[PDB]
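User: Predict structure, ligand potassium ion.
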Amino acid sequence: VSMRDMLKAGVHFGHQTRYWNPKMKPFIFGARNKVHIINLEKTVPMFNEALAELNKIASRKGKILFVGTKRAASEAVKDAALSCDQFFVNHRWLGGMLTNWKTVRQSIKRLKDLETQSQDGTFDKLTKKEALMRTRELEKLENSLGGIKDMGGLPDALFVIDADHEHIAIKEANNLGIPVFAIVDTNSDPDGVDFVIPGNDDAIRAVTLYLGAVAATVREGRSQ
RNA sequence: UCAGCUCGUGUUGUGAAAUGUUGGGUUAAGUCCCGCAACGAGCGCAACCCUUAUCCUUUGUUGCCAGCGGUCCGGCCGGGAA
Ligand SMILES: [K+]
Ligand SMILES: [K+]
Ligand SMILES: [Mg+2]
Ligand SMILES: [Mg+2]
Ligand SMILES: [Mg+2]
Ligand SMILES: [Mg+2]
Ligand SMILES: [Mg+2]
Ligand SMILES: [Mg+2]
Ligand SMILES: [Mg+2]
Ligand SMILES: [Mg+2]
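Assistant: Predicted complex:
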């Protein structure tokens, strides 16, 4: 992607100056109307490198986990992960999804053993109220684990929208050595991210631009 | 007979420990929902047990007497299964 595409989407629009993290100072171009403007001259070469490294991991048959539970990037993280056949978390990240994977697994199993029952017909059997409490455990397990049900283990990379909002996921990945790619706005701390991509993480326009180019370089990375 | 008491893994703290189990509502209830660095699990709560309140089906004596038929007026007798 190029500098003009980032502009029309609003990638260069940061937060108000009073909310900045001073560690973001190198990636800042200036301020306009008391709002920080990210330096797109750095967003481009840093994203391409992130797009380059994501390509290699996909070529080696790696698993990419897309994390974005904000109400702006929620439904797009799921669309980008599917059109790419990888995995995603787009509702509240469960603390310990990765560092406590050996426990969160048993909830993936329960999600499977309860979906085959939705497909079997055991819900037409139960005493109504018992089938109704089981169809509700389904939707809850689906909303939280529906994107990682086939992951079958720790992923090899994480792509995150908003490093601050998903600070727990990033900490879990650093804990296990899993490389973190993340969009980092001006109010966020870039110290945990291995591949920083400074850019607006709130506008739906900019998010889709990030997710499209990443979903592309992994589809191409899985072909070769 | 009060609704409590804990553990595994994870995470936080040099540590004793903490979190979960707190919060917003709700319930007889740590009851349930929602939120949530927690995710799950156990012992308790509830349910499963006995009894009581309504109805059905079967069975009809030592229990029963609606319609019958007699009568010493006693279901007493013949019967009747209501
Ligand atoms: K302390
Ligand atoms: K513990
Ligand atoms: Mg320690
Ligand atoms: Mg207690
Ligand atoms: Mg405690
Ligand atoms: Mg409460
Ligand atoms: Mg309980
Ligand atoms: Mg809680
Ligand atoms: Mg009880
Ligand atoms: Mg008579």
